[PDB]
Structure formats: C-alpha cells, structure tokens
Amino acid sequence: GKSHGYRSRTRYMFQRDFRKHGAVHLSTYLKVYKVGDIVDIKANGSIQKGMPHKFYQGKTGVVYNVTKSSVGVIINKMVGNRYLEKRLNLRVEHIKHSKCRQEFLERVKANAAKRAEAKAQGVAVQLKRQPAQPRESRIVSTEGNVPQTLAPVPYETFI
Amino acid sequence: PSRFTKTRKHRGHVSAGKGRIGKHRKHPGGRGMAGGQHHHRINMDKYHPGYFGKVGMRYFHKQQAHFWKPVLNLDKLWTLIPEDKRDQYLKSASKETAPVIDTLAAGYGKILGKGRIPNVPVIVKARFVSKLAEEKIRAAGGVVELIA
Amino acid sequence: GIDHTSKQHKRSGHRTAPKSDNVYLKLLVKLYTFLARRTDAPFNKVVLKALFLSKINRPPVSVSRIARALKQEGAANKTVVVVGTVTDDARIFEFPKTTVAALRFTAGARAKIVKAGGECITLDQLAVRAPKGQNTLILRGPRNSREAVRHFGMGPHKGKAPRILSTGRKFERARGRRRSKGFKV
Amino acid sequence: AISKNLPILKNHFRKHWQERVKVHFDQAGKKVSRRNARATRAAKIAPRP
Amino acid sequence: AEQVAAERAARKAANKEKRAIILERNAAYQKEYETAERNIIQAKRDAKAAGSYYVEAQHKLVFVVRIKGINKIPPKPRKVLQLLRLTRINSGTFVKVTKATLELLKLIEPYVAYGYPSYSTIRQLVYKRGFGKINKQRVPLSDNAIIEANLGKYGILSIDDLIHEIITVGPHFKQANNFLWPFKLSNPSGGWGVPRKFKHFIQGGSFGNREEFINKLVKSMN
Amino acid sequence: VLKKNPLKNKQVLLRLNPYAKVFAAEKLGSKKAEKTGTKPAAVFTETLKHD
Amino acid sequence: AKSKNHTAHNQTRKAHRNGIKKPKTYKYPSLKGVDPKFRRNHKHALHGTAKALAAAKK
RNA sequence: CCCUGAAAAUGGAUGGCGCUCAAGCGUGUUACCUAUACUCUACCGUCAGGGUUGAUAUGAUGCCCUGACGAGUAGGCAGGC
RNA sequence: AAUAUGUAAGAAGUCCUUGUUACUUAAUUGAACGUGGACAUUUGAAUGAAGAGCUUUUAGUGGGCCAUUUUUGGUAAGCAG
RNA sequence: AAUACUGCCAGCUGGGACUGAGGACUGCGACGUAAGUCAAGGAUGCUGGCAAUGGUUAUAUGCCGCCCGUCUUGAAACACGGACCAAGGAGUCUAACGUCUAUGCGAGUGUUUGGGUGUAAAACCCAUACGCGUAAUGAAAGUGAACGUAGGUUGGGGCCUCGCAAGAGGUGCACAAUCGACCGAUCCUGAUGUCUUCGGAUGGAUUUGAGUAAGAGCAUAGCUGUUGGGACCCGAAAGAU
RNA sequence: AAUUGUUGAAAGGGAAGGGCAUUUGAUCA
C-alpha cells in the first residue's frame, strides 16, 4: 500500500550534518525565550522528544508560551484557500533565534538615533531606506590602462 | 405564487434548472433518512451530533403535570400588580401596609432572584422560592409566604 | 480586451432606497436624502443609511437601554435618535426626562416617556428641530441577540446551537456529545 | 435526502393518508345548523332554560 | 444682485496672476533643460579631448508598453503586469529605474517593450494622450486648473510641471505617475519594422529592451 | 464635450502653455550652439583605429 | 472501467479565485494552551491592577 | 544542395494549376493586404462617482453630468411579452 | 545550483519613570498587564489597488482531455499512470 | 567646408477619406492699447435638382455557410429520435420547517375550537383556556444568573468641546477578540447546629452548557431549498389478493 | 395547417433552404 507517517521521507531531513554528530553544544539551552520573540525551527536528530513535523521544518514563528524546557510556536499553515494558525510546542533544541528581527531592532535604534540627532537641527532626516539607484556619471582615465584589443579564439579540439 | 415561481422563467431551458450531467432523477441518496452511519455520517457528525444512541433511563407514563413549575424572575415581580396601584405602592414604602402578590394565582410556581427589586416592603406568596430571591426580598424588607 | 483584476459590472452591495412600499417611509427617506445631499453633517447620511435597514437589521431599542445610554457623562441633555422601534421595559423603575425620536413607538414606551416627562417625536420633527443633528445621540439595538444567529456557523468544537425542533433528553444528546459513547463533539 | 444545516423533522405521512383527509369545509354551515337546532330546541322545551 | 461683475474681475485677476507664475516656472524649466543638455555635450567633449572616456549615468526613467495580448500568460507575469498597470495591449506606463523595478521588468520582458524615453516624446505623449485619474475616473487634461487641483499639494500645478516631474525623477514622481492614467496607444503607423514581434531586439523583434530606439516606436504608435 | 489635441490647435496649445508664444517668438526650437572646437587626444585617436 | 485517480490540476486556480487570506490578528490573542500557573497569576495581577487603578483614578 | 539506399494495393495531392539565374532552398532591406485585435467618434445596456423640491411642474423608482465595461455551457438573479 | 518557499521591513512601534501578582528569584531579582510621560513633513524598501473586512442561503459540479517542460510502466502507441 | 545617418522644431504648407454628436449664456484662452473679434467646454453660410431617395419580397452576382435536440473530453457523423400538420403534454399540491424579505403587535403574541351578531360559506365583535417566547443546566433527584455606573482593556460609526482649517481631548450605541463576575453538572476542601448522621455556609478548578450580563419575541404573506407523501413526466425483469 | 388542382409571377449544367451588399422585376408614404 501507501505509507505517510510522522517521519516519512525525512531520511535526508532529520539527519545530522557531516562531522557534526554526538551531543549538542551547550549554547541552545542558555538562550532565553520570551513571548513574542520570532524564532526559526530546525529539527535535530539526536533528540527525538518534541520533534517538529516535516512541514514545520524551516518555518519561522512567534513564541506564545514558555514551559520548563519547551516553547510554543504559532505557524500559519496554508490549507485549501486559507491560512490556519497552528500552536505547536517544541523543545528548545529544535529552535533557533532569527537574525532578521535583531537586524530590525538595530535598524530601529539607528532610526531613532538619527531622528534625534538630525532633527536637533531639522534638515532632511530621510529616515526611509532606498533601493539600488542607478549609478551616476563617472570618468575613466587611460593612464597606464590602455584598452587591450580582444578577439574570439579559434575553435580547438583539446582532449 | 405561480406567476412569481421560477418555473415560468425556467421554461425554455432544457434541464429546467436541474443540470445536464446529473438529471433530476428519483431519490439518489435514499428515501427519508436513509443512511446515518455509512454515507451521511459526515453531515450527521458535523451538523447533528448526538442523534444515535440512548442517554438516560426510562420514565414510563410521564405526565407533564408534576413538572409544572413556571419561573418568574425578580425584575418581573411588580408587573403582576395592576399599574393603577403599582405607583401608589411604590411610593408607599411602609411595613404596616405593603402590596401582596399571588404568583400561584398569576400562574408562576417558582420565583428566582434576578433584577434588584427596589427597597420597598412587599409580600409574595409562591409554592417554591430560591435562596437568592428570598435573601434579596428579606434584605429589601419583604417576606416570602409559602403556599400550596 | 482587459485582463480584469476584479468583477465587471458588480453591484456596490449596499441597499439604495427602501425595499418596502410604505409611503410614509419613502417620504421620510426622500426628506433625509435631501438633507444628507444638501448638508454636510454625517448624522443625516448615517440616518438615511439606517433607514434602509431591514427588520432583522433594525432591532428594537428599550427604554432601559435609552436610560443607560443617557446615564453617560454629558449625555443627559441630548436628543436620543432610534432608527426603528422603541419598546417598553418593565424591569426599570426610574426613567429620566429626555427627548426620543423614532419611527414607531410602542404604546407602553410612549406612556412611560409621557409619565416621566419626556416627549415622543418623529424623524421629521427631529430634522426640523436639528437639521444638522446637533446635540443628538444615535442608539442601535442588539443585532446579534436574535435566536436565529445562534445556529450560524455550526461545526465541530464550536458549540453553535444545533438546529433542533424538540428539547430534552435523547434529542441530540447521544454519541457525539459525550465521551462515554465515543467522542465529544 | 440529507442536506445542509437544517433541522430534523418527523413527518408521519407514510400510509395511505390521502384516503383519510378530513377538510372542514362546512364550518360556517355547521355553525348555522347548530344555531338553528339550538333555537328549535329552545322553542320546543318551553321557557325552560 | 450686481456683484457678478466684481467676481468676474476678481477671477480674471487671479487667473492672470496664476498665468504669470506658470510662465515664469516654464521659462525656468526650459532654461534648465537647455543648460543640462549642453553641459552633458561639453562634458563628453572634454572627456574625449583629455584622453579619457565619459561614462554616462544610467537612465533613471523608462517607458514600458505591452506588446502581448491577455491570453496565454503565466500567473506570476500576469500579476506583475497588473501591478505595473498593463492590462490592455498597446498600453504604456512610465517606470523609475531601481533594482526592484529592473527585476520586475526582467520578469515580464517577453510581453513588453521598454526603453529610455526623451523629452520630446514625453511631451508629445502627455499632450496628446494625457489623461488624469480624478475620483477613479479618466478625466482628460485640457487645462492646468485640474492638474493644480489634483496635484497642488506636491508643488505641481501645470501640464509642463507634470512633464518636468516625469522627465526628471523627483520627490513626488510616484504621485505624478500614479495620477496619470496609463497611455492607450494605437498600432504603429509605419509598422513594427520586424517580421516577428515576439523575438528579442538583438534577435530581430520588438520584444526586449530598445534603449533610445523606443522613442521612434512610441511616436509611431502615438 | 470633445477633446482637442495640442500641437495641432494653436489656441489650445497657447492655453496649456503660456510659454509657447515666447518660444515661437524667440525661435528656441532652432538655436545655434557655441562654435567651440576641441581635438581628441592621440591615445583615443589611435584606439579608434587600432586593429 | 478504470478512471483517473488523483490530480492537482486547477486546484491552485480554484484556491486563488477567492484570494488566500492571512488570519485576522488582534491586539489581545487567545490565552489557550498557556501555562495554567501563569494564567492564574495573570488573573490575580489583573484584578490587583484594576483595583489599584479604580482606587487611584475615578 | 542533389543522387542510390527508399517497395502496397479505387485515381490524387506543397490545395491544385504550375514553377528551373524558380513561383525550390538560407539569410539581409523596404513597400503592400487584413481579426469581432489596437486609437477616435455615433448609439444601446450595465456598473461606479455626483448634481437636481427656490417654484406653477407631474414620473426624485423622474431628469441630467462624468468615467469604465459589455464573450460564454450547466446554474443563479433581475427587467419585461 | 536555478526554480520553488517561510519570516521581518514599525504607532498593536521604540524609549524614560514606576503600580499590581497567589508566577518566579537569595533579593524590587526577572515575566505579564499596566498608569504617567517623549517621538505625525520623510508612519520607517519599490509597485499597484472600479476599497477592504465579516455573516446567511443555495443552484450545478464530483467520468475529462490536449499543449511546453520535468518524468514512471511499456520496444513503441492518437497507450496507461 | 559639404554630404550620409540619427534625433528636434511650441517651423510652414499641398492633396484625400470618415465623422456633425451637443442646442439662449455660464469655463479656460488668443487677437485687438480700446471698441469688438476669434480656428477658444461638438458645423455653419451659399447654391443646384426632384417633390426620385428609401421600406417589403423574388431572381441574379462576389464571399461565407454540414442536421435539429440529447449523451460525451471529443457529434454533422457510418451513434441515437424525427415524413408532415392540427389538438393535449410534463418542478404541481399538502403537513412540518431552514435563510432572506414585507406587514402588524411587541415581553408579549395568534379572533375565526367555539359563542353572539349578520344584507347569510361574505363581514363584525368576544370571556376562559391553549401554541411559542420571556431561564437554563443535569440521566435524574435537584438547582437556578449584578462584589461593579450589569466589570476592565483594545478597535470602533456618531455626538460634544477646543481649534481658521487641518488637527487635539471626552462620551462612545451596534459589532470583533481577550481577561473577569454570576447560574446548572462534575472533581474538591468542609461554618454554626444536630433525630450521629442529617444538614452544605465559605473558598477553588488547564473541566464542562444549545446560559445571564437592560428581554426580542409571536402571527400572516412572498422567493429559494429539504423531508414525507404518486412528487417534473413516461418506462421495467418481479410479489400478493 | 399538413395535402392537392387551375390561374398569375420567378428560378432550375449532379439538390433546395440561409447570412453579409447591391442591380433588376413587382409593390409600398
């Protein structure tokens, strides 16, 4: 027949990295998790208790519950034509912090610092980011950089 | 009716509003309530839970006369008194003369405490009373008389 | 042709002009349309929009609810406006003086207001006194308190008043509602 | 047979009920006949009530 | 009731003052255009003369027209076209050049032709097929009053000001472009010039970037 | 009631652009540039024809 | 008489006709699945701060 | 490029007529014809945004202004004989 | 690798002071909810949006096929998947 | 120097086709120092011919065009029914209902079971009962909803005040989520008293309800849908008396 | 009405019937 289990088709997914087997480094257990923090989910093969499902591997979610050694994650799963929230409790081991949120707090702090300093005089704060604008005009000098003529090479039958 | 019935507008259409791939044949799912645990179990479990099975014991020859206990809350207690004297008895808040209500005669066999009746003396006669209703009435200044 | 990003020739989804054939209601609707078109007060537009509401969308407003609304700070000297019917509540005993304008007034509610010291005016009189709706307060009754909306959205693990005719034992209280006969909802 | 969120109805029409349909088309006629019989009895039984 | 003449005179005075400001601003814009063009030309000349090469700045504005029908379109390019306001064939919009816009154009390149427009073709487009968006309606622009009323908050009050905002990307270029309805052009008068449109410009077709060659196609289609 | 096209109706063109009259009077559409002359460097001259 | 078993064709279009909607978020989320001790202490703290606010500002 | 390889049964298919510095083959450039496709205009219907009780004057479900769109089986709704 | 895919790009935010708890901490030590107070041009990347959100009812549907690309069974199939 | 190529002209001008919508003025512009004029928010002037143009049908010409309805992914098929015309012909009715809409009354609602009256199956009037709702939860015994301005907080139309406007503060009906309070069941702890086994005050629950928290319901009619009935119409091979 | 006979009109190289536009014949304000 057909087989669709809790750990089906995870042979290369729930597997430790090369030369990275054994116990887990004592850094994950020292991370402090609070309600509202955004974290990523990455299953670890050494610990088989509280392991997330295949779908929730690599997903990013907010923390809503704190337990002895576990946190609750809310993940939006697309079923049919709608997104449904899923509150799943996972161990600390199979969860890591997300650096995008930290970059957001850093940008916010710099944003407020610039809003203070620039507005102390009140001129062109320009607190908003901009994309890659087209390059402006430039002048190139051929002092020791004379353009070398290039021609296509003949076809060769090297073996 | 017939003029406003959609059949008149459906006249001309071959299927008459019943489809082409599936024609309006006889009962395809059965007659009446054919199937409640085999093919209509999904609907019978997601819309009408509790249809199949027995719950309690059996009460043979259950007469609906022993359970005739109409309820009347405290807020709708002064409505039984006629309006022409309701205001008079509202302003006359004295213990020597208070309005008397016969809830049994009004058709209510039980009084429940809800409504925060005004602090006026009153007399209420009922077959059954509740603890909260009695406490509220006695705090207001009235008394509850037990009648049969 | 156009790769349409939305439905073509779609209706606004709102009710323009009353569906009823009440001549007085149409006259009031015309008057409030004139007001809301030649004035700038949003009160006229709100009243005109509420005049198109159906019976289920226009629940009755009780005198107790009116008193509760007027009990707010600074609302004592305000004109209550109810787009619908004003009912009488026997659970209240002290009704303050007010001025309530509504389409239809229950006889008991009208008697209660008259005895308290208020008056019952219509929407036309309310417009005449306050063309811009000055010092008015709009009251709407509970719309979700109907018995027909409890059955809406029925599903497992919802508890949404299954549609039944009889009540009591052995009436949709068996397997599917208890853990002793299988599953619970 | 079984459909969306509708109530369960118990309709007791499965025998030959079409042969036992009693429609009281003679309500007014029966009332008139009863009144006439009452008047006739009152006339017959003398001033007795 | 004789004050009609007084209001007429006041209206004429206000209109004359407004026209004076418009004329001054138009003269300033024309002087700036001539100065910029001459400055670029002489900069190229000095770069050539001094034993160097002048690398012109990349064009900051492009014009994109749709050359494909609304049938047999993949969903992601279709959505990108809807977001870029290209729902009719032979419809054109102006686009400010950024990284995001460049990657957007790289996705729907097969169904559009885009290139760097010039001041003359921009002015011709705005004059002939220039339509605004007021109250979600396509009201034609035949006076500066409507433009001032619908764009005066951003410092734009005339058709020449709108053209200036289009050609030179500024603080309010987004609003200036959003106010303008997409230009519904016709088929080219002299033809597309290629036997097969659905091939790249280097491959011999209208599909793909045309750079400065888009001006001739736009004027032929307009 | 009807849309008149600029660049073909002089009245509408003048109404839209008051500067059109000054432009036509000064003939700014055909302006002679300064008669300046610069010579390209020998490096560029040789690179042009370097095969 | 064999028949087609399973196919995902047109399912994406069917789901996209009515655009896929993100769940509606609220300022106060549901408090289910939370630690019972934390919920009890939150109830006690909420009662305390409500009483303090009522006593302070009237 | 062309030729042998390369043989199926009613009489027939680059559509055929026919074509040989092609009207065959690859590539380069202009002009020419057209779809219910594109731009404008006239009319009808639908939708949206509005004006119009300061009248004798009626149909404010009436009149007028502006913009956009108009395919279709089963099927739904609405207006009419 | 490419493609495909999740999250964040702000007022439901940030910062200063300090009220509550039966949670917790050696402990006013942390957590949640708070009060007061400060930050509206440029409210915190680009683009777009005949506006968006929400509820009820129900007709028909539950036999598909073909086209590019990836690809299973089969020598192949206008074969099946 | 000229010329080829590309791009510009708010430079001029020759020729041809389609269109004439709107109907006293309202606006934006130009000429004219000024009167006034204009190609400036949709065409007028003059003149000629007749009092034939054009509508319906038949034929002819250039082009296009397979047989109606059903089944089917695929019909015109060598798949099915049709020689023609005239008459009849197919989602109707009842009982209980669901959503919506209209009317009447409204914490009440429904005369027509019946009685009186009656121009006589018409119409009018009426007392008590009765149907549903106003209280629900448990198998049942039973019990039975305000610590509060009928709670706190956020979002929230409207209203009030300040403010030239914009904006700021307060109240915020309806409705969305969450935290609280009370009622029934279950698990618990157990205050006085006492027919020593009765009585269940007070304090809780990751428990549970088709609850309360200023009622919204009842009657009739209308579209659509379901059930039972012969059930949109027609058709079996069978069984019994 | 199906069907049939006469009179009057039209067409007819292995079908008839229809649509897009017009000439001709008959008729029409």
PDB file of all heavy atoms in Angstrom, chain C residues 170-185:
ATOM      1  N   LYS C 170     -32.522  12.414  25.104  1.00  0.00           N
ATOM      2  CA  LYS C 170     -32.482  11.583  23.893  1.00  0.00           C
ATOM      3  C   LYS C 170     -32.790  12.379  22.621  1.00  0.00           C
ATOM      4  O   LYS C 170     -33.233  11.815  21.615  1.00  0.00           O
ATOM      5  CB  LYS C 170     -33.409  10.359  24.012  1.00  0.00           C
ATOM      6  CG  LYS C 170     -34.907  10.608  23.870  1.00  0.00           C
ATOM      7  CD  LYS C 170     -35.717   9.501  24.522  1.00  0.00           C
ATOM      8  CE  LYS C 170     -37.031   9.271  23.793  1.00  0.00           C
ATOM      9  NZ  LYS C 170     -36.814   8.809  22.395  1.00  0.00           N
ATOM     10  N   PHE C 171     -32.535  13.688  22.638  1.00  0.00           N
ATOM     11  CA  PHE C 171     -32.683  14.552  21.468  1.00  0.00           C
ATOM     12  C   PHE C 171     -31.328  15.205  21.214  1.00  0.00           C
ATOM     13  O   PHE C 171     -31.034  16.272  21.759  1.00  0.00           O
ATOM     14  CB  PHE C 171     -33.785  15.589  21.671  1.00  0.00           C
ATOM     15  CG  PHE C 171     -35.171  15.010  21.664  1.00  0.00           C
ATOM     16  CD1 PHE C 171     -36.070  15.314  22.673  1.00  0.00           C
ATOM     17  CD2 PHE C 171     -35.577  14.165  20.645  1.00  0.00           C
ATOM     18  CE1 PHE C 171     -37.346  14.785  22.668  1.00  0.00           C
ATOM     19  CE2 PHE C 171     -36.853  13.631  20.634  1.00  0.00           C
ATOM     20  CZ  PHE C 171     -37.738  13.943  21.647  1.00  0.00           C
ATOM     21  N   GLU C 172     -30.511  14.555  20.382  1.00  0.00           N
ATOM     22  CA  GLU C 172     -29.160  15.023  20.061  1.00  0.00           C
ATOM     23  C   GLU C 172     -28.312  15.195  21.321  1.00  0.00           C
ATOM     24  O   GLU C 172     -27.552  16.156  21.456  1.00  0.00           O
ATOM     25  CB  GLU C 172     -29.203  16.312  19.237  1.00  0.00           C
ATOM     26  CG  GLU C 172     -30.081  16.213  17.995  1.00  0.00           C
ATOM     27  CD  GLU C 172     -29.531  16.997  16.817  1.00  0.00           C
ATOM     28  OE1 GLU C 172     -28.600  17.804  17.018  1.00  0.00           O
ATOM     29  OE2 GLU C 172     -30.032  16.805  15.689  1.00  0.00           O
ATOM     30  N   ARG C 173     -28.448  14.250  22.252  1.00  0.00           N
ATOM     31  CA  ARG C 173     -27.608  14.184  23.444  1.00  0.00           C
ATOM     32  C   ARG C 173     -26.825  12.880  23.518  1.00  0.00           C
ATOM     33  O   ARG C 173     -26.171  12.615  24.532  1.00  0.00           O
ATOM     34  CB  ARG C 173     -28.454  14.350  24.710  1.00  0.00           C
ATOM     35  CG  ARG C 173     -29.096  15.716  24.871  1.00  0.00           C
ATOM     36  CD  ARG C 173     -29.011  16.180  26.322  1.00  0.00           C
ATOM     37  NE  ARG C 173     -29.985  17.212  26.665  1.00  0.00           N
ATOM     38  CZ  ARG C 173     -30.078  18.403  26.088  1.00  0.00           C
ATOM     39  NH1 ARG C 173     -29.234  18.786  25.143  1.00  0.00           N
ATOM     40  NH2 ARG C 173     -31.033  19.241  26.480  1.00  0.00           N
ATOM     41  N   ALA C 174     -26.881  12.062  22.472  1.00  0.00           N
ATOM     42  CA  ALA C 174     -26.246  10.752  22.442  1.00  0.00           C
ATOM     43  C   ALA C 174     -24.833  10.884  21.866  1.00  0.00           C
ATOM     44  O   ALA C 174     -24.269  11.981  21.835  1.00  0.00           O
ATOM     45  CB  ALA C 174     -27.123   9.772  21.660  1.00  0.00           C
ATOM     46  N   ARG C 175     -24.240   9.757  21.460  1.00  0.00           N
ATOM     47  CA  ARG C 175     -22.901   9.703  20.877  1.00  0.00           C
ATOM     48  C   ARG C 175     -22.635  10.887  19.955  1.00  0.00           C
ATOM     49  O   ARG C 175     -23.443  11.205  19.079  1.00  0.00           O
ATOM     50  CB  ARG C 175     -22.727   8.393  20.103  1.00  0.00           C
ATOM     51  CG  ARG C 175     -21.853   8.511  18.860  1.00  0.00           C
ATOM     52  CD  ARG C 175     -22.204   7.453  17.828  1.00  0.00           C
ATOM     53  NE  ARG C 175     -21.142   7.270  16.847  1.00  0.00           N
ATOM     54  CZ  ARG C 175     -21.050   7.944  15.707  1.00  0.00           C
ATOM     55  NH1 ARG C 175     -21.946   8.857  15.370  1.00  0.00           N
ATOM     56  NH2 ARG C 175     -20.036   7.694  14.885  1.00  0.00           N
ATOM     57  N   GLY C 176     -21.489  11.531  20.159  1.00  0.00           N
ATOM     58  CA  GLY C 176     -21.168  12.785  19.513  1.00  0.00           C
ATOM     59  C   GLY C 176     -21.245  13.980  20.435  1.00  0.00           C
ATOM     60  O   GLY C 176     -20.797  15.068  20.052  1.00  0.00           O
ATOM     61  N   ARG C 177     -21.805  13.814  21.634  1.00  0.00           N
ATOM     62  CA  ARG C 177     -21.834  14.859  22.644  1.00  0.00           C
ATOM     63  C   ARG C 177     -21.237  14.426  23.973  1.00  0.00           C
ATOM     64  O   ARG C 177     -20.995  15.284  24.830  1.00  0.00           O
ATOM     65  CB  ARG C 177     -23.275  15.341  22.880  1.00  0.00           C
ATOM     66  CG  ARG C 177     -24.086  15.547  21.610  1.00  0.00           C
ATOM     67  CD  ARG C 177     -24.128  17.014  21.213  1.00  0.00           C
ATOM     68  NE  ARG C 177     -23.884  17.896  22.347  1.00  0.00           N
ATOM     69  CZ  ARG C 177     -23.102  18.966  22.311  1.00  0.00           C
ATOM     70  NH1 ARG C 177     -22.471  19.323  21.204  1.00  0.00           N
ATOM     71  NH2 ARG C 177     -22.950  19.696  23.411  1.00  0.00           N
ATOM     72  N   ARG C 178     -20.992  13.132  24.173  1.00  0.00           N
ATOM     73  CA  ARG C 178     -20.457  12.611  25.421  1.00  0.00           C
ATOM     74  C   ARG C 178     -19.225  11.763  25.141  1.00  0.00           C
ATOM     75  O   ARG C 178     -19.109  11.137  24.085  1.00  0.00           O
ATOM     76  CB  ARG C 178     -21.498  11.770  26.173  1.00  0.00           C
ATOM     77  CG  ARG C 178     -22.893  12.364  26.182  1.00  0.00           C
ATOM     78  CD  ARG C 178     -23.794  11.625  27.152  1.00  0.00           C
ATOM     79  NE  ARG C 178     -23.508  11.994  28.533  1.00  0.00           N
ATOM     80  CZ  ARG C 178     -24.249  12.825  29.252  1.00  0.00           C
ATOM     81  NH1 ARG C 178     -25.330  13.398  28.748  1.00  0.00           N
ATOM     82  NH2 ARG C 178     -23.894  13.091  30.506  1.00  0.00           N
ATOM     83  N   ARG C 179     -18.303  11.750  26.106  1.00  0.00           N
ATOM     84  CA  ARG C 179     -17.101  10.937  25.986  1.00  0.00           C
ATOM     85  C   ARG C 179     -17.347   9.472  26.321  1.00  0.00           C
ATOM     86  O   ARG C 179     -16.501   8.628  26.003  1.00  0.00           O
ATOM     87  CB  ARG C 179     -15.998  11.491  26.889  1.00  0.00           C
ATOM     88  CG  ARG C 179     -14.838  12.123  26.136  1.00  0.00           C
ATOM     89  CD  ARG C 179     -13.657  12.388  27.062  1.00  0.00           C
ATOM     90  NE  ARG C 179     -13.091  11.167  27.626  1.00  0.00           N
ATOM     91  CZ  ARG C 179     -12.520  10.195  26.924  1.00  0.00           C
ATOM     92  NH1 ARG C 179     -12.378  10.278  25.610  1.00  0.00           N
ATOM     93  NH2 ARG C 179     -12.069   9.117  27.558  1.00  0.00           N
ATOM     94  N   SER C 180     -18.477   9.151  26.952  1.00  0.00           N
ATOM     95  CA  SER C 180     -18.774   7.770  27.314  1.00  0.00           C
ATOM     96  C   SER C 180     -19.323   6.960  26.149  1.00  0.00           C
ATOM     97  O   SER C 180     -19.356   5.728  26.232  1.00  0.00           O
ATOM     98  CB  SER C 180     -19.767   7.733  28.477  1.00  0.00           C
ATOM     99  OG  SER C 180     -21.094   7.556  28.009  1.00  0.00           O
ATOM    100  N   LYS C 181     -19.753   7.616  25.075  1.00  0.00           N
ATOM    101  CA  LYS C 181     -20.301   6.950  23.900  1.00  0.00           C
ATOM    102  C   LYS C 181     -19.466   7.257  22.663  1.00  0.00           C
ATOM    103  O   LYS C 181     -19.989   7.419  21.559  1.00  0.00           O
ATOM    104  CB  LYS C 181     -21.760   7.347  23.679  1.00  0.00           C
ATOM    105  CG  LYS C 181     -22.494   7.748  24.948  1.00  0.00           C
ATOM    106  CD  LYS C 181     -23.989   7.509  24.820  1.00  0.00           C
ATOM    107  CE  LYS C 181     -24.343   6.064  25.132  1.00  0.00           C
ATOM    108  NZ  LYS C 181     -23.817   5.635  26.457  1.00  0.00           N
ATOM    109  N   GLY C 182     -18.149   7.339  22.838  1.00  0.00           N
ATOM    110  CA  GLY C 182     -17.262   7.628  21.730  1.00  0.00           C
ATOM    111  C   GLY C 182     -16.519   8.939  21.875  1.00  0.00           C
ATOM    112  O   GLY C 182     -15.650   9.077  22.742  1.00  0.00           O
ATOM    113  N   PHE C 183     -16.853   9.911  21.033  1.00  0.00           N
ATOM    114  CA  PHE C 183     -16.187  11.202  21.006  1.00  0.00           C
ATOM    115  C   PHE C 183     -17.137  12.298  21.475  1.00  0.00           C
ATOM    116  O   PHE C 183     -18.361  12.146  21.452  1.00  0.00           O
ATOM    117  CB  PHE C 183     -15.672  11.525  19.599  1.00  0.00           C
ATOM    118  CG  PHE C 183     -16.735  11.465  18.537  1.00  0.00           C
ATOM    119  CD1 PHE C 183     -17.433  12.604  18.173  1.00  0.00           C
ATOM    120  CD2 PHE C 183     -17.034  10.271  17.903  1.00  0.00           C
ATOM    121  CE1 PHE C 183     -18.410  12.553  17.199  1.00  0.00           C
ATOM    122  CE2 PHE C 183     -18.011  10.213  16.929  1.00  0.00           C
ATOM    123  CZ  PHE C 183     -18.700  11.357  16.578  1.00  0.00           C
ATOM    124  N   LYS C 184     -16.550  13.414  21.903  1.00  0.00           N
ATOM    125  CA  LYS C 184     -17.295  14.579  22.367  1.00  0.00           C
ATOM    126  C   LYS C 184     -17.152  15.686  21.329  1.00  0.00           C
ATOM    127  O   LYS C 184     -16.093  16.315  21.228  1.00  0.00           O
ATOM    128  CB  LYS C 184     -16.795  15.039  23.734  1.00  0.00           C
ATOM    129  CG  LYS C 184     -17.726  16.014  24.438  1.00  0.00           C
ATOM    130  CD  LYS C 184     -17.245  16.321  25.846  1.00  0.00           C
ATOM    131  CE  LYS C 184     -18.037  17.461  26.468  1.00  0.00           C
ATOM    132  NZ  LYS C 184     -19.053  18.014  25.531  1.00  0.00           N
ATOM    133  N   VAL C 185     -18.223  15.922  20.571  1.00  0.00           N
ATOM    134  CA  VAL C 185     -18.259  16.952  19.533  1.00  0.00           C
ATOM    135  C   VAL C 185     -17.092  16.806  18.561  1.00  0.00           C
ATOM    136  O   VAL C 185     -17.290  16.698  17.351  1.00  0.00           O
ATOM    137  CB  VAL C 185     -18.280  18.365  20.147  1.00  0.00           C
ATOM    138  CG1 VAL C 185     -18.725  19.384  19.112  1.00  0.00           C
ATOM    139  CG2 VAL C 185     -19.196  18.407  21.362  1.00  0.00           C
TER     140      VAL C 185
END
